[PDB]
Design an enzyme around this catalytic site. Structure first.
Site, PDB file in Angstrom:
ATOM      1  N   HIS A 178       0.989  -1.110  -0.070  1.00  0.00           N
ATOM      2  CA  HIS A 178      -0.145  -0.096   0.116  1.00  0.00           C
ATOM      3  C   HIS A 178       0.650   1.442  -0.160  1.00  0.00           C
ATOM      4  O   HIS A 178       0.110   2.329  -0.255  1.00  0.00           O
ATOM      5  CB  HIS A 178      -1.114   0.118   1.171  1.00  0.00           C
ATOM      6  N   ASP A 197       0.307  -7.701   2.033  1.00  0.00           N
ATOM      7  CA  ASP A 197       0.595  -5.889   1.903  1.00  0.00           C
ATOM      8  C   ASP A 197       2.301  -6.191   2.044  1.00  0.00           C
ATOM      9  O   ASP A 197       2.707  -5.739   3.012  1.00  0.00           O
ATOM     10  CB  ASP A 197      -0.159  -5.099   3.030  1.00  0.00           C
ATOM     11  N   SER A 240       2.874   1.590  16.145  1.00  0.00           N
ATOM     12  CA  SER A 240       3.136   2.354  14.861  1.00  0.00           C
ATOM     13  C   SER A 240       2.062   3.165  14.206  1.00  0.00           C
ATOM     14  O   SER A 240       0.865   3.216  14.963  1.00  0.00           O
ATOM     15  CB  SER A 240       3.672   1.683  13.712  1.00  0.00           C
ATOM     16  N   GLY A 251       2.680   6.893   8.123  1.00  0.00           N
ATOM     17  CA  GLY A 251       4.125   7.379   7.960  1.00  0.00           C
ATOM     18  C   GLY A 251       5.073   6.551   8.201  1.00  0.00           C
ATOM     19  O   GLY A 251       6.271   6.425   7.419  1.00  0.00           O
ATOM     20  N   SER A 283       4.341   3.111   7.674  1.00  0.00           N
ATOM     21  CA  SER A 283       4.118   1.918   6.883  1.00  0.00           C
ATOM     22  C   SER A 283       5.175   1.729   5.865  1.00  0.00           C
ATOM     23  O   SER A 283       5.824   2.448   5.481  1.00  0.00           O
ATOM     24  CB  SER A 283       2.697   2.585   5.625  1.00  0.00           C
ATOM     25  N   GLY A 284       5.290   0.332   5.660  1.00  0.00           N
ATOM     26  CA  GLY A 284       6.122  -0.324   4.886  1.00  0.00           C
ATOM     27  C   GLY A 284       7.502  -0.405   5.627  1.00  0.00           C
ATOM     28  O   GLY A 284       8.625  -1.176   5.301  1.00  0.00           O
TER      29      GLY A 284
END
Ligand SMILES: [Ca+2]
Length: 223
Positions: A40, A84, A172, A175, A177-178
């Site tokens: 995403h 994801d 978390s 921002g 994410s990943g």
């Protein structure tokens, strides 16, 4: 990261920032040419920034390397965030050093109760917005499958796990994410989703990286 701490410059040397004119997601360097992030986080036009601490100051240890290719998982479902996970290939290999280093992929899936290191440049507030310039860190434990499913009924697949604190306050957030969830020195999770940040009974949900090692390895052997 809400309720975390300042990591310390370059103490998380596999953490990358993905930039499209601005930081928008984290990622993990898994070898000199490849980054793992969340599907995403896909954007066209990604520059990978390694060796960062303050993402708004060039401090001297960065490497900025354009992506040449991004590969979203073939089964990624953007509605449920099942699968994801994304790979990003760098146009040129990073120079690996004490500040820019890869993280190992796991051999075994991490265990409920293991405390993992989660890091990123995402929002630090549960209510409202404040984005830090320096990298933040959080230690958070993996929750049982049953507790994860109870928190998000009808939403958790076998490619997700929860981590964090059901009382709220530490998680978390947007921002991050990943970015990485590192447990016992291996990349076990990717910051994926959650209901708000750091809310009571709504822990973070993470992509279960151990289910993707064979896809990652075959894809990097082929691109
Ligand atoms: Ca910097």
């Amino acid at each position: 990261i809400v309720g975390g701490y300042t990591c310390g410059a370059n103490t998380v040397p596999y953490q990358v920032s993905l930039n499209s004119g601005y930081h928008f997601c984290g990622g993990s360097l898994i070898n000199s040419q490849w980054v793992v992030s969340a599907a995403h986080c896909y954007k066209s036009g990604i520059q990978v920034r390694l060796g960062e601490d303050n993402i708004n100051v060039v401090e001297g240890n960065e490497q900025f390397i354009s992506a040449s290719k991004s590969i979203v998982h073939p089964s990624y479902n953007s509605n449920t965030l099942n699968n994801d996970i994304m790979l990003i290939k760098l146009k040129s290999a990073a120079s690996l050093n004490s500040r820019v280093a890869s993280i190992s992929l796991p051999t075994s899936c991490a265990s409920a109760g293991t405390q993992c290191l989660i890091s990123g440049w995402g929002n630090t507030k549960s209510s409202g917005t404040s984005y830090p310039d320096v990298l933040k860190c959080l230690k958070a434990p993996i929750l049982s499958d049953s507790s994860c499913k109870s928190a998000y009924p009808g939403q958790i697949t076998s490619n997700m796990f929860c981590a964090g604190y059901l009382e709220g306050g530490k998680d978390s957030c947007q921002g991050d994410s990943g970015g990485p969830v590192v447990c016992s020195g291996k990349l076990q999770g990717i910051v994926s989703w959650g209901s708000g940040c750091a809310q009571k009974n709504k822990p973070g949900v993470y992509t279960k990286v151990c289910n993707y090692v064979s896809w990652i390895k075959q894809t990097i052997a082929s691109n």
